[PDB]
């Protein structure tokens, strides 16, 4: 969990502004939008990186390029790549970061409106964020379904296949015969209906409050739609914050006068924010339990 600053530049003052806005609006709440940057510190191997064991196992299995592992047509022709990825990435093999535990502290102080995540690791929930406050915009392993007829399966029958040497005879539907897979959104599928429904409600809520709210976008390249449409859809008069090593998406393309950009690691941003809020003592208890 140990962190350091990204460069010699200090971000403490920028982070201070965030704290002063929450101190001045004490009954207000924050919406978070987060991606794979917040789980890097957990040791999750990036399937697109040649430095990982995951990458080289997928190449050896003849995956044509990384993102095919999450492609419907590919999985139906050959499920082995996706099953080998699931074995390495399956929830419960990793532990939540300091940033993950900040979401849980915000919820404990009653200042979390929602977290929208494009990660499939389920580390927000593992850290104790409640079910009503999370939207897993790209699904998770906690449900499974038949890709052909939609019949529902418990996630254990898929999981038990990952323990076999070698992995073979993939799970097939007892009604229609097609492959059953986890409820992970693949490239070319629509996202779950709760995504569009909750953003509709949270977009209304944000407009009505203009207790002024805050939206903080953390560790995401804003390269995958429709997720990445959310920050352009934030009301002009609700203050946006970006904690990301690089300036991306609508914050690069259409900057706003009140946009605040913080180039910092998510874990280091967490530790600075908690310090500027005065919540060091309650944080330290969450971290030791």
């Amino acid at each position: 969990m140990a962190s350091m600053s990204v460069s010699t530049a200090s971000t403490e003052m920028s982070v201070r502004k965030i704290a002063a806005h929450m101190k001045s609006n004490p009954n207000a709440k924050v919406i978070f939008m987060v991606g794979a940057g917040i789980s890097t510190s957990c040791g999750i191997p990036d399937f697109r990186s040649p430095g990982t064991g995951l990458y080289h196992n997928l190449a050896r299995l003849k995956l044509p390029y990384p993102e095919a592992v999450f492609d419907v047509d590919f999985f139906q022709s050959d499920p082995l790549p996706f099953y080998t990825l699931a074995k390495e990435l399956y929830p419960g093999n990793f532990r939540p970061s300091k940033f993950h535990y900040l979401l849980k502290l915000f919820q404990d102080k009653d200042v979390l409106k929602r977290v929208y995540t494009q990660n499939i690791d389920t580390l927000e929930r593992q850290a104790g964020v409640k079910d009503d406050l999370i939207i897993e915009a790209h699904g998770s392993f906690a449900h499974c379904h038949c890709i052909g007829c939609g019949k529902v399966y418990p996630p254990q029958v898929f999981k038990s296949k990952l323990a076999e040497h070698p992995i073979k005879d993939f799970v097939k539907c007892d009604v229609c015969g097609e492959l059953v897979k986890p409820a992970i959104v693949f490239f070319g599928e629509d996202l779950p209906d709760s995504f569009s429904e909750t953003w509709l409600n949270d977009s209304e809520w944000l407009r009505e409050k203009i207790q002024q709210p805050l939206v903080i976008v953390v560790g995401t390249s804003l390269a995958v739609y429709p997720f990445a449409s959310l920050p352009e859809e934030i009301p002009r008069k609700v203050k946006r914050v970006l904690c990301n090593l690089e300036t991306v998406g609508d914050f690069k393309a259409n900057k706003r006068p009140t946009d605040l950009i913080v180039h910092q690691y998510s874990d280091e941003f967490a530790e600075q924010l908690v310090e500027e809020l005065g919540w060091q003592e309650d944080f330290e208890k969450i971290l030791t339990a």
């Binding site: 490239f187 629509d190 996202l191 390269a223 995958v224 429709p226």
Partner: peptide, 8 residues
């Protein structure tokens, strides 16, 4: 609703 998961 946004459409299917994709890039761009």
């Amino acid at each position: 609703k946004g459409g299917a998961k994709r890039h761009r």
